[PDB]
Amino acid sequence: ETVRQLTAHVLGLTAAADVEMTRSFKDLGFDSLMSVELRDRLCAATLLYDHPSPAETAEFV
Amino acid sequence: ETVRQLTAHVLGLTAAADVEMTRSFKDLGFDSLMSVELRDRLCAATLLYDHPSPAETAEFV
Amino acid sequence: EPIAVIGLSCRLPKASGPQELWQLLDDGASAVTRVPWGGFLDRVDTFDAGFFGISPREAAAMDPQQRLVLELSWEALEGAGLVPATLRDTGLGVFVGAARDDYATLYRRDHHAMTGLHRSLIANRISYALGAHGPSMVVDTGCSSSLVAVHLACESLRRGESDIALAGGVNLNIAAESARETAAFGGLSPDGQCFTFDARANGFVRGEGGGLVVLKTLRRALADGDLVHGVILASAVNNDGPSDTLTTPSRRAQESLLTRVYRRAGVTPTEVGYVELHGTGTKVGDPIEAAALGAVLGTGRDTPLPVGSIKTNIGHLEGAAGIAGLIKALLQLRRRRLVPSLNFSTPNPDIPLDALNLRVQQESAPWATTLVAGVSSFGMGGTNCHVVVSAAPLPWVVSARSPQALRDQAGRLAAWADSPAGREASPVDIGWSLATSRTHFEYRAVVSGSDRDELVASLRALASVDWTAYFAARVELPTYAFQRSRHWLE
Amino acid sequence: EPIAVIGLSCRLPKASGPQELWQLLDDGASAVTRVPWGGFLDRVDTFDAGFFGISPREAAAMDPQQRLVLELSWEALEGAGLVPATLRDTGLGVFVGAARDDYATLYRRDHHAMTGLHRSLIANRISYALGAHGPSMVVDTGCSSSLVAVHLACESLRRGESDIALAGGVNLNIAAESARETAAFGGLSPDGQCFTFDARANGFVRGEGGGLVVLKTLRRALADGDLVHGVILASAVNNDGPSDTLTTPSRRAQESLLTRVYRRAGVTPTEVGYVELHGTGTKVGDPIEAAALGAVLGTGRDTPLPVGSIKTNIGHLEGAAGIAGLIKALLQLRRRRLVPSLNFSTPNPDIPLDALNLRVQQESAPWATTLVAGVSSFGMGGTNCHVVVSAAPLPWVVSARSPQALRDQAGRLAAWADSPAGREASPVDIGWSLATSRTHFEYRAVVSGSDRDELVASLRALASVDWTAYFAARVELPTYAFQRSRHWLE
Ligand SMILES: *CC(=O)NCCNC(=O)CCNC(=O)[C@H](O)C(C)(C)COP(*)(=O)O
Numbered sequence A, B: 001e002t003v004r005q006l007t008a009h010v011l012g013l014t015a016a017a018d019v020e021m022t023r024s025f026k027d028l029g030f031d032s033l034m035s036v037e038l039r040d041r042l043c044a045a046t047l048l049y050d051h052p053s054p055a056e057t058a059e060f061v
Numbered sequence C, D: 001e002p003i004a005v006i007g008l009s010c011r012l013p014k015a016s017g018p019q020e021l022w023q024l025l026d027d028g029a030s031a032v033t034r035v036p037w038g039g040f041l042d043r044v045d046t047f048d049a050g051f052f053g054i055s056p057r058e059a060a061a062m063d064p065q066q067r068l069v070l071e072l073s074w075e076a077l078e079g080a081g082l083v084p085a086t087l088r089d090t091g092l093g094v095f096v097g098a099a100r101d102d103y104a105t106l107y108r109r110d111h112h113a114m115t116g117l118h119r120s121l122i123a124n125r126i127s128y129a130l131g132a133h134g135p136s137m138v139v140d141t142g143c144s145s146s147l148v149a150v151h152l153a154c155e156s157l158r159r160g161e162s163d164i165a166l167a168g169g170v171n172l173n174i175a176a177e178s179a180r181e182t183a184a185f186g187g188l189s190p191d192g193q194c195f196t197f198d199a200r201a202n203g204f205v206r207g208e209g210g211g212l213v214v215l216k217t218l219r220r221a222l223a224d225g226d227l228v229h230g231v232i233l234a235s236a237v238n239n240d241g242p243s244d245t246l247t248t249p250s251r252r253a254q255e256s257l258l259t260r261v262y263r264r265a266g267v268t269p270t271e272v273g274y275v276e277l278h279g280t281g282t283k284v285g286d287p288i289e290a291a292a293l294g295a296v297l298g299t300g301r302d303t304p305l306p307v308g309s310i311k312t313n314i315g316h317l318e319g320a321a322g323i324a325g326l327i328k329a330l331l332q333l334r335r336r337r338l339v340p341s342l343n344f345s346t347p348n349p350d351i352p353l354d355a356l357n358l359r360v361q362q363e364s365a366p367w368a369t370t371l372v373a374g375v376s377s378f379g380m381g382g383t384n385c386h387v388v389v390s391a392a393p394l395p396w397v398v399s400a401r402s403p404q405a406l407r408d409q410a411g412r413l414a415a416w417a418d419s420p421a422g423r424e425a426s427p428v429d430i431g432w433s434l435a436t437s438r439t440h441f442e443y444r445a446v447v448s449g450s451d452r453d454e455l456v457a458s459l460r461a462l463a464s465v466d467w468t469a470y471f472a473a474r475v476e477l478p479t480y481a482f483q484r485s486r487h488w489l490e
């Protein structure tokens, strides 16, 4: 539940169910600044380049 | 004195002595709208195309 | 060297596609309505951000012109029978003519802000989306920017710099400051109509929209087996030069441009059957254009030359309008028919049509002899362009990125099949085109049947793998169904 | 086909001419000062409206960029030995790359507002001033707009569309909104310095100015007897394509562009003695540029390749900066000397200069073997351009439109004669050039003497007809002395 939430708000979506763990981070509209912001936000609760898929990062938490 | 004055103000110059009766009206930066405005202002006190020089128009008044 | 056109896309008021544009033009209707006087694009604040992999925050501050051009390019690529995924790391050039930044004007009254308000990226983003290695530039020549971009793309193709080119323009009226400036300049028609070559001409009306076309060399198009919409023969760009006024057009410059472009194209008089006028409906430009056309093409003709302008239907689109006119010509080169021109009751006394050997097309009549047409675009600064174009010499699978998108695509396919244009296409050709000329997305839906009725019924019912070996001639198919969501600054 | 350069003009911070620019570069000084951090053009609100026949009211609402480009074009035409009056009704093309509208931004917070706030007219006005019939367009590719315009002018000259071309760019920072947007984007150096290829690189500094050059085919230049400043061999424009980010540049695209441009130019490695870096001083672009240059030109060389950037002296001029760099290269191709590059103390750890076989020029040394140089301009959107240029293979009469202008011209001529460059020119050649290569204005002043001292003394004293049969080789002369008056909106 740490990927559906805490990431849709960063992307600016309204509902957490609008994200799909099938496309790459770049395919979702992620740049260096957004990657840094996502890492900083997830740290409270280059790792994105190592695993460019939300599904892969989901299993880590 | 009707060409040094009543025309420099139309062009936006500060002093009436900055105009020269040697260049054409087009060479002074005159278009159709400014020609119409000049004719209307001079009427109170296509004639410009007939005599495109201020010196020629000076002798008419 | 001739240039072959293999596809086009457009977005115009009351015309979201080439078929809609042809229906509007043939019916003789006008899309100029009241402000929700001018042509409008029925909401421009909607975009499919997920299709192009753009975050909603980025798309919110992005210029809607960029989104419109991206959608137009995708539609043109889909309609040309070329899979975009096969165009990656290729020498594909993009030439878009934009001369308006109303979105930046509204915004100036973030980090993707600067990025979303740059005029160059309007083309560059396409090179980012398609992964093309060809040149990408934005040209600004006024109201003839699109035709200049088309000419530049043709020259680049001739020189071998680019293999496939995308050429066109866009113009969206959003900020009221532009309208205030235009009204202050004194060029808007008081009644909001474009009386092209008419005695009631008192200005022009403003329109918005965009268009794009795909350009490729004729030899490569014939070698690749592509279907040719039209053949551009020659093009030329010049300037008015020593005109009487910076805004006043020059007749001699237009005459020289027409003479040189028709000498380069190799087409003599009595061979061109239609000329697309600039048609601004002004009291000065129209007589000059008519005199130039009569001196160049009007003379030495046994029959009057038909003329017309597309601005009488949708309005003046400024930098984009030019390509729109060319698109109209392309339609007139595909259906072999002419469409009427509105806002014409009596000839202009300043325009001696009898002496100029010209006549305004005001009825729908078949076109008979190959057919050659010319499109002219004149900029207010003084840039003039002319383009001469002649006529060209059972399971069903659908794909989409969303179930709602899949249902919309199925419904659109069923509607197109119900259309007579779809009826003229055999089911085998339709299936082969869907399997080959359409990209395979994530979500897939495959249907089976015996005849058209069964497949159409199944597609409506569900609306609410190497298939090449399984299966012909390539046929046009409806484009992608975009799921647009509101995106605006706040 | 090679292209011959016959003249150039520039306007840069602390450098109002090619001689001033060479003096600034040779002395190793930096023009980046505090805001009255960046380079500034010492008042841009002054214009000579009467010289171009422009009313003060029209010039008040006119973009200062248009005035600057007009003055630059006039100076370039004067310095090329061609009388502007002989260029009327000729096929002369104008290509200016502009990507900024800060004046419109300020004004938007009359009927001239239209013609004064339009980006296209920046070039079109020139076609109105010179009465040229060649194409006139404005290109927008980001920071490489000027190089793209130069390439387009060269292609038009090669295709025969234009006989003489004017190519360059301009960029003026006026509105504070642009500065705020740039600061928000996060690219400004905290200390306001451009550390090109330096370990202290932390961004770039902004500069303003402009430049223009005159382009003609080598065969026509040799036939016309013109003196050649440099010979452009080939040019190429491409796009990054499928980069990691829309902002991140691609190394492979730059390598392919360099390879293709050097293969077209016919110049193999070990023949180019200098390369003009883009030199933005960023932590990402600089290593990529260094790696690409080392992979393309660095390999197969017995000696390290000298590199440098002009942004270390005046700053980043954005869309104009490119042509400025080319101008610098032209200077390095005329004096046969190299100028030092500032803001370089230690090599960047991310840049292996030893492996890349590259070295930064930090001293003034003579250039020895013909000499070949390359100028690169990369657009932030993704457009990249590269240009390869090699080295080229007694009464005095003055004229002006005002007595004060005549006195200023006489004083400038006397000062130029006192300069060593004027001393290297014989009096007969100077008189012949003044009589032939300089246009005759209304007010005229003719002096006579026996030697240089007498003529110079008379010219200073007064500072406060077919002459062809009377008189050689054409030599450069100082340009016109503009009487600038304040013009600003209120
Ligand atoms: C006008 C112009 O072309 N200027 C170029 C000056 N800027 C650069 O070269 C920036 C190159 N890009 C980067 O350094 C990174 O892409 C950014 C801008 C730091 C973004 O990194 P990340 O957030 O994607």
Ligand SMILES: *CC(=O)NCCNC(=O)CCNC(=O)[C@H](O)C(C)(C)COP(*)(=O)O
Binding pocket: B031, B032, B033, B034, C142, C143, C144, C187, C204, C245, C247, C248, C249, C280, C282, C283, C284, C285, C318, C319, C378, C379, C380, C381
């Ligand atoms: C965007 C674009 O190119 N639009 C063209 C529409 N406008 C025109 O065609 C204007 C042509 N010029 C004129 O009609 C006259 O030059 C003016 C504008 C009435 C000025 O006349 P005079 O005051 O010089």
